[PDB]
């Protein structure tokens, strides 16, 4: 079962340096674990702005998670998560950049709490969205609302904690889930 998966990862300064390193390590671990041909990966850093660090076609040409993320420059600015999700939905899931028409679209949004910006993510509604939290401010009442909004429904199945989520033996079968 094919899956095109985008890591949308938070490069803003609210994260502690070690927390951002854990995000990098998490993405690389998942790509290393879920390495079979059915999976393709892209990664987009967001802060004030959004940068595709690598697309699906880069992933296929290299398939070396360490080399693909080698040159990521830490943005360390604000947290425009809404604009970021919209960016992925419209600018990353493209046949142009190596997306597969038959593949299930999955987004792993890795972040530490609420966004600087607001709006809607209607354009991403056909995408299966997981929210992977890190940090001491990730689940408060300040952010509860935003995280529910970003996650696929039921949110209780899609809002995760990086620390516990990364240990799942059946992680690759979990991200392939399509009935929910």
């Amino acid at each position, epitope marked *: 079962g094919n899956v095109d998966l985008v890591f949308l990862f938070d490069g803003s300064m609210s994260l502690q340096p070690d927390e951002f390193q854990k995000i990098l390590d998490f993405m690389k671990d998942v790509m290393k674990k879920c390495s079979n041909t059915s999976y393709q990966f892209a990664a987009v850093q967001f802060s004030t702005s959004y940068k595709t660090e690598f697309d699906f076609s880069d992933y296929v040409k290299w398939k070396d998670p360490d080399a693909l993320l080698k040159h990521v420059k*830490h943005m360390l600015l604000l947290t425009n998560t809404f604009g970021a999700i919209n960016y992925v939905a419209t600018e990353v899931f493209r046949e142009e950049l190596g997306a597969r028409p038959d593949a299930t679209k999955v987004l792993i949004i890795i972040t530490d709490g609420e966004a*600087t910006d607001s709006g809607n993510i209607d354009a991403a509604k056909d995408i299966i969205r997981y929210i992977i939290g890190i940090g001491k401010h990730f689940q408060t009442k300040e952010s509860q609302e935003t995280l529910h909004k970003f996650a696929s429904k039921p949110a209780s199945e899609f809002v995760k904690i990086l620390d516990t989520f990364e240990k799942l033996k059946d992680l690759c079968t979990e991200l392939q889930k399509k009935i929910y």
Partner: antibody
Amino acid sequence: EVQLLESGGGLVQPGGSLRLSCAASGFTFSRYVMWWVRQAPGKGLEWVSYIWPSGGNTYYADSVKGRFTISRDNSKNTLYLQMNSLRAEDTAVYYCASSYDFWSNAFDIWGQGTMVTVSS
Amino acid sequence: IQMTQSPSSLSASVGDRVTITCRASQSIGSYLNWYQQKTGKAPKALIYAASSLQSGVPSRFSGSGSGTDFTLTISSLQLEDFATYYCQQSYSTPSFGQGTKVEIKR
């Protein structure tokens, strides 16, 4: 525009107490870690305290621990500093400031400052 | 984390290019910020994240560096730029460099 306005500064005898206030306007105060940062005359900037958005968790520089208390009223968008047992070394300009990106360790907005003088 | 700023003070003519350095006691990646403080005024952010100029700040200001060594540049010093400049690491809880006092040479 966004601003922070301090008030409450003045002359206090050593051992006395004083309360500073900082009114926020133009931004969503309740989302931000808030700080007090002070500057003694002709010296550098020293953070003395900060408080999480909800106002539960509080933190203090060792120079002020046990003597100062930070608090906030998100309903009035106001930040407070209760200074007790004041020493000569606490004489400084006191600024409030917000965390850049809600809770980074960079400073976003600064108040105008309020002078505190501790002298008998 | 100790931030060593350099020099402590400098004198330069209007239109001159000005360079201020800041060294950290450990690698702090890009968690390095610059503030300007004029007399009897609060600090004001010029640069976040080593190189990111903040809106409103004149484009003559620029920041560079990562790891341990950082630089604030004023491409053409103006009368307005008379002030004290501080670097500030945001890697852990804030610490500041000692400051650099810029005077106008005439």
